[PDB]
PDB file of all heavy atoms in Angstrom:
ATOM      1  N   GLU B  90     -28.922 109.878  93.203  1.00  0.00           N
ATOM      2  CA  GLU B  90     -30.006 110.149  94.138  1.00  0.00           C
ATOM      3  C   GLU B  90     -30.875 108.929  94.344  1.00  0.00           C
ATOM      4  O   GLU B  90     -31.181 108.549  95.478  1.00  0.00           O
ATOM      5  CB  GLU B  90     -30.805 111.348  93.659  1.00  0.00           C
ATOM      6  CG  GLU B  90     -30.002 112.606  93.553  1.00  0.00           C
ATOM      7  CD  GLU B  90     -29.510 113.142  94.872  1.00  0.00           C
ATOM      8  OE1 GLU B  90     -30.113 112.807  95.888  1.00  0.00           O
ATOM      9  OE2 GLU B  90     -28.503 113.875  94.879  1.00  0.00           O
ATOM     10  N   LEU B  91     -31.366 108.316  93.277  1.00  0.00           N
ATOM     11  CA  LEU B  91     -32.261 107.142  93.407  1.00  0.00           C
ATOM     12  C   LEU B  91     -31.521 105.843  93.441  1.00  0.00           C
ATOM     13  O   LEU B  91     -32.037 104.852  93.977  1.00  0.00           O
ATOM     14  CB  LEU B  91     -33.279 107.130  92.263  1.00  0.00           C
ATOM     15  CG  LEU B  91     -34.239 108.334  92.227  1.00  0.00           C
ATOM     16  CD1 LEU B  91     -35.217 108.159  91.073  1.00  0.00           C
ATOM     17  CD2 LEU B  91     -34.969 108.466  93.525  1.00  0.00           C
ATOM     18  N   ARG B  92     -30.312 105.791  92.928  1.00  0.00           N
ATOM     19  CA  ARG B  92     -29.498 104.565  92.867  1.00  0.00           C
ATOM     20  C   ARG B  92     -30.276 103.431  92.190  1.00  0.00           C
ATOM     21  O   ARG B  92     -30.345 102.323  92.705  1.00  0.00           O
ATOM     22  CB  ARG B  92     -28.980 104.189  94.255  1.00  0.00           C
ATOM     23  CG  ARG B  92     -27.875 105.036  94.677  1.00  0.00           C
ATOM     24  CD  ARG B  92     -27.547 104.942  96.190  1.00  0.00           C
ATOM     25  NE  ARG B  92     -26.276 105.585  96.478  1.00  0.00           N
ATOM     26  CZ  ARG B  92     -26.058 106.294  97.601  1.00  0.00           C
ATOM     27  NH1 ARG B  92     -27.027 106.496  98.446  1.00  0.00           N
ATOM     28  NH2 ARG B  92     -24.847 106.818  97.800  1.00  0.00           N
ATOM     29  N   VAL B  93     -30.845 103.762  91.023  1.00  0.00           N
ATOM     30  CA  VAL B  93     -31.637 102.833  90.258  1.00  0.00           C
ATOM     31  C   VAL B  93     -31.157 102.841  88.836  1.00  0.00           C
ATOM     32  O   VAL B  93     -30.829 103.932  88.290  1.00  0.00           O
ATOM     33  CB  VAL B  93     -33.163 103.130  90.371  1.00  0.00           C
ATOM     34  CG1 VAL B  93     -33.528 104.398  89.582  1.00  0.00           C
ATOM     35  CG2 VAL B  93     -33.988 101.962  89.889  1.00  0.00           C
ATOM     36  N   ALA B  94     -31.047 101.696  88.198  1.00  0.00           N
ATOM     37  CA  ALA B  94     -30.677 101.650  86.789  1.00  0.00           C
ATOM     38  C   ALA B  94     -31.865 101.920  85.897  1.00  0.00           C
ATOM     39  O   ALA B  94     -32.868 101.165  86.008  1.00  0.00           O
ATOM     40  CB  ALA B  94     -30.049 100.320  86.445  1.00  0.00           C
ATOM     41  N   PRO B  95     -31.792 102.903  85.001  1.00  0.00           N
ATOM     42  CA  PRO B  95     -32.994 103.323  84.298  1.00  0.00           C
ATOM     43  C   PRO B  95     -33.527 102.292  83.314  1.00  0.00           C
ATOM     44  O   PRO B  95     -34.715 102.401  82.942  1.00  0.00           O
ATOM     45  CB  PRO B  95     -32.532 104.640  83.587  1.00  0.00           C
ATOM     46  CG  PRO B  95     -31.088 104.424  83.417  1.00  0.00           C
ATOM     47  CD  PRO B  95     -30.638 103.707  84.630  1.00  0.00           C
ATOM     48  N   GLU B  96     -32.694 101.373  82.818  1.00  0.00           N
ATOM     49  CA  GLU B  96     -33.174 100.310  81.927  1.00  0.00           C
ATOM     50  C   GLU B  96     -34.332  99.487  82.511  1.00  0.00           C
ATOM     51  O   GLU B  96     -35.091  98.848  81.786  1.00  0.00           O
ATOM     52  CB  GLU B  96     -32.064  99.357  81.547  1.00  0.00           C
ATOM     53  CG  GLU B  96     -31.071  99.970  80.580  1.00  0.00           C
ATOM     54  CD  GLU B  96     -29.883 100.628  81.286  1.00  0.00           C
ATOM     55  OE1 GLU B  96     -30.028 101.006  82.455  1.00  0.00           O
ATOM     56  OE2 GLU B  96     -28.818 100.774  80.648  1.00  0.00           O
ATOM     57  N   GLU B  97     -34.497  99.481  83.865  1.00  0.00           N
ATOM     58  CA  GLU B  97     -35.421  98.584  84.501  1.00  0.00           C
ATOM     59  C   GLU B  97     -36.794  99.198  84.760  1.00  0.00           C
ATOM     60  O   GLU B  97     -37.678  98.474  85.163  1.00  0.00           O
ATOM     61  CB  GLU B  97     -34.849  98.081  85.850  1.00  0.00           C
ATOM     62  CG  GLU B  97     -33.665  97.130  85.665  1.00  0.00           C
ATOM     63  CD  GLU B  97     -32.807  97.086  86.925  1.00  0.00           C
ATOM     64  OE1 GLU B  97     -33.333  97.395  88.010  1.00  0.00           O
ATOM     65  OE2 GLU B  97     -31.617  96.734  86.789  1.00  0.00           O
ATOM     66  N   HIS B  98     -36.948 100.513  84.492  1.00  0.00           N
ATOM     67  CA  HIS B  98     -38.133 101.204  84.949  1.00  0.00           C
ATOM     68  C   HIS B  98     -38.671 102.163  83.894  1.00  0.00           C
ATOM     69  O   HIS B  98     -37.872 102.918  83.273  1.00  0.00           O
ATOM     70  CB  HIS B  98     -37.828 101.991  86.232  1.00  0.00           C
ATOM     71  CG  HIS B  98     -37.428 101.112  87.372  1.00  0.00           C
ATOM     72  ND1 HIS B  98     -38.386 100.578  88.234  1.00  0.00           N
ATOM     73  CD2 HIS B  98     -36.258 100.692  87.848  1.00  0.00           C
ATOM     74  CE1 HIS B  98     -37.778  99.831  89.151  1.00  0.00           C
ATOM     75  NE2 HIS B  98     -36.470  99.884  88.928  1.00  0.00           N
ATOM     76  N   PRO B  99     -39.962 102.117  83.620  1.00  0.00           N
ATOM     77  CA  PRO B  99     -40.554 103.243  82.833  1.00  0.00           C
ATOM     78  C   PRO B  99     -40.356 104.541  83.586  1.00  0.00           C
ATOM     79  O   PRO B  99     -40.300 104.586  84.799  1.00  0.00           O
ATOM     80  CB  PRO B  99     -42.047 102.860  82.786  1.00  0.00           C
ATOM     81  CG  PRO B  99     -42.050 101.380  83.049  1.00  0.00           C
ATOM     82  CD  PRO B  99     -40.986 101.127  84.012  1.00  0.00           C
ATOM     83  N   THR B 100     -40.205 105.620  82.798  1.00  0.00           N
ATOM     84  CA  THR B 100     -39.958 106.926  83.367  1.00  0.00           C
ATOM     85  C   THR B 100     -41.047 107.881  82.915  1.00  0.00           C
ATOM     86  O   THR B 100     -41.490 107.857  81.786  1.00  0.00           O
ATOM     87  CB  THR B 100     -38.584 107.448  82.909  1.00  0.00           C
ATOM     88  OG1 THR B 100     -37.565 106.512  83.293  1.00  0.00           O
ATOM     89  CG2 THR B 100     -38.305 108.810  83.567  1.00  0.00           C
ATOM     90  N   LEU B 101     -41.492 108.749  83.842  1.00  0.00           N
ATOM     91  CA  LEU B 101     -42.585 109.672  83.597  1.00  0.00           C
ATOM     92  C   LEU B 101     -42.051 111.094  83.830  1.00  0.00           C
ATOM     93  O   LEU B 101     -41.523 111.393  84.880  1.00  0.00           O
ATOM     94  CB  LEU B 101     -43.786 109.398  84.472  1.00  0.00           C
ATOM     95  CG  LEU B 101     -44.847 110.487  84.503  1.00  0.00           C
ATOM     96  CD1 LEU B 101     -45.536 110.596  83.158  1.00  0.00           C
ATOM     97  CD2 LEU B 101     -45.855 110.214  85.570  1.00  0.00           C
ATOM     98  N   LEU B 102     -42.252 111.929  82.818  1.00  0.00           N
ATOM     99  CA  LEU B 102     -41.549 113.228  82.726  1.00  0.00           C
ATOM    100  C   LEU B 102     -42.582 114.309  82.552  1.00  0.00           C
ATOM    101  O   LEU B 102     -43.633 114.112  81.913  1.00  0.00           O
ATOM    102  CB  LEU B 102     -40.546 113.272  81.590  1.00  0.00           C
ATOM    103  CG  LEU B 102     -39.303 112.369  81.706  1.00  0.00           C
ATOM    104  CD1 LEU B 102     -38.563 112.394  80.372  1.00  0.00           C
ATOM    105  CD2 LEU B 102     -38.414 112.868  82.812  1.00  0.00           C
ATOM    106  N   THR B 103     -42.292 115.473  83.092  1.00  0.00           N
ATOM    107  CA  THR B 103     -43.315 116.515  83.297  1.00  0.00           C
ATOM    108  C   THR B 103     -42.856 117.754  82.565  1.00  0.00           C
ATOM    109  O   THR B 103     -41.684 118.089  82.563  1.00  0.00           O
ATOM    110  CB  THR B 103     -43.549 116.764  84.778  1.00  0.00           C
ATOM    111  OG1 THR B 103     -44.076 115.555  85.356  1.00  0.00           O
ATOM    112  CG2 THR B 103     -44.547 117.814  85.009  1.00  0.00           C
TER     113      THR B 103
END
Side-chain angles (χ1 to χ4, degrees):
Chain B
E90 301 292 338
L91 297 182
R92 284 165 169 144
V93 72
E96 288 93 337
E97 291 159 23
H98 297 274
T100 303
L101 168 67
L102 293 170
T103 296

